[PDB]
């Protein structure tokens, strides 16, 4: 069923710069944890509650703490960290499946605060000004104060029939949090006191259709020049006018798991692992690349003008953005990849399921 490893003529030569273990990772549990990067430090976590700051250049520990709770005599109970990590201004942020959000200080890795949010936090917390936004699995948006973690406001987007796989972080633009979700809506809320600007139904309520086991739709909206791009939970790409939320168009692809925007292109990965580029204005497909079909792709990322994806066999593949052809390949880990690659400031990070963080070339 799975596609054979494509044969490639590496245009260049990729290697592991370094790699540091992080407990036992996430193994086969559902999680959205991935590495963050700020001021040449790499942060990473695992399901059980382990978190490490790393030196970006060689990945040696700067610090290392556990958030695991008390159990019986001898084990700890897993903290179940799920959304993160996110770092801004000397706090490291993580959400959990126990509906806790943690703020750890960047300096030592101590609890600055810990708050009880309104449902599970499976998506990265998102920082705007002095506000940490949390989209919970039960359709609530909450703004916590950055300093103490007190809940400044709570908004109800309306409780989803089911929760589904897929990140759903909020995104921010011009003083508004824009958020999708499993409810089939996208909403814009003003970040001052959580006032509702608009709400647009982009598909019907889940479900409403059968849920397929390969669905894993990331409903985090992306806002580029006055347009909101958002995947509905059924896999369709939609474009909305940022001002009124009114639907511009809908690409009834029905199969998309992740996409990114850059410049005048949208790049995406569908549920079958077909990769594809489209035009930003109209979302018309320019090329398609199916050689990875049914290997199991992560979401895609842009690094040094190439598209990179990981599969669950432990390879990274580099893809040419103009024609969709393979530029490079690499075997990297054997547990496999699941959560997203990360590209910031000339570093290319990725955490495998066994928990191991890599920095690439
Ligand atoms: Na996320």
Curated annotation (Swiss-Prot):
Q: How does it sit in the membrane?
A: Lipid-anchor
Any one cellular-component term (Gene Ontology): Bam protein complex
What is one Pfam family matched by this protein?
PQQ_2
Question: What is a single molecular function from GO for this protein?
Answer: identical protein binding
GO biological process assignments:
Gram-negative-bacterium-type cell outer membrane assembly; protein insertion into membrane
Q: What does the function comment of this entry state?
A: Part of the outer membrane protein assembly complex (Bam), which is involved in assembly and insertion of beta-barrel proteins into the outer membrane. Nonessential member of the complex, which may orient the flexible periplasmic domain of BamA for interaction with other Bam components, chaperones and nascent outer membrane proteins. Efficient substrate folding and insertion into the outer membrane requires all 5 subunits.
This chain belongs to which protein, by name? Outer membrane protein assembly factor BamB
Which gene is transcribed and translated to give this protein? Answer: bamB
């Amino acid at each position: 069923k799975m596609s054979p490893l494509p044969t490639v003529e590496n245009q260049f030569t990729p290697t592991t710069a370094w790699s540091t273990s992080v407990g036992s990772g996430i193994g086969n549990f559902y999680s959205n944890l991935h590495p963050a990067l700020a001021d040449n430090v790499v942060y990473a976590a695992d399901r059980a509650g382990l978190v490490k700051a790393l030196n970006a250049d060689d990945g040696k520990e700067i610090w290392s703490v556990s958030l695991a709770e008390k159990d019986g005599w001898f084990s700890k109970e897993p903290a179940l960290l799920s959304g993160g990590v996110t770092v801004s201004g000397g706090h490291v942020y993580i959400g959990s499946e126990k509906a806790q959000v943690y703020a750890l200080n960047t300096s030592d890795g101590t609890v600055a605060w810990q708050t009880k949010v309104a449902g599970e936090a499976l998506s990265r917390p998102v920082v705007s000004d002095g506000l940490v936004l949390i989209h919970t699995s039960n359709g609530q948006l909450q703004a916590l104060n950055e300093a103490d973690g007190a809940v400044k406001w709570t908004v109800n987007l309306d409780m989803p029939s089911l929760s589904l796989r897929g990140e759903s972080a909020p995104t921010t633009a011009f003083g508004a949090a824009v958020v999708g979700g499993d409810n089939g809506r996208v909403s814009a809320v003003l970040m001052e006191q959580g006032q509702m600007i608009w709400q647009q139904r982009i598909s019907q309520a889940t479900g409403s259709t059968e849920i397929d086991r390969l669905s894993d739709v990331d409903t985090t909206p992306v806002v580029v020049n006055g347009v909101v791009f958002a995947l509905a939970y059924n896999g369709n790409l939609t474009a909305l006018d940022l001002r009124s939320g009114q639907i511009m168009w809908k690409r009834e692809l029905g199969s998309v798991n992740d996409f990114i925007v850059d410049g005048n292109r949208i790049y995406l990965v569908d549920q079958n692992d077909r990769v594809m580029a489209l035009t930003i204005d109209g979302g018309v497909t320019l090329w398609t690349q199916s050689d990875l079909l049914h290997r199991l792709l992560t979401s895609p990322v842009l690094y040094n003008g190439n598209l990179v994806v990981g599969d669950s066999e432990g390879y990274l593949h580099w893809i040419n953005v103009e024609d969709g052809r393979f530029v490079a390949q690499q075997k990297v880990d054997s547990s496999g990849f699941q959560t997203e690659p990360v590209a910031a400031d000339g570093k290319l990070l990725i955490q495998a399921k066994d928990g191991t963080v890599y920095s690439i070339t």
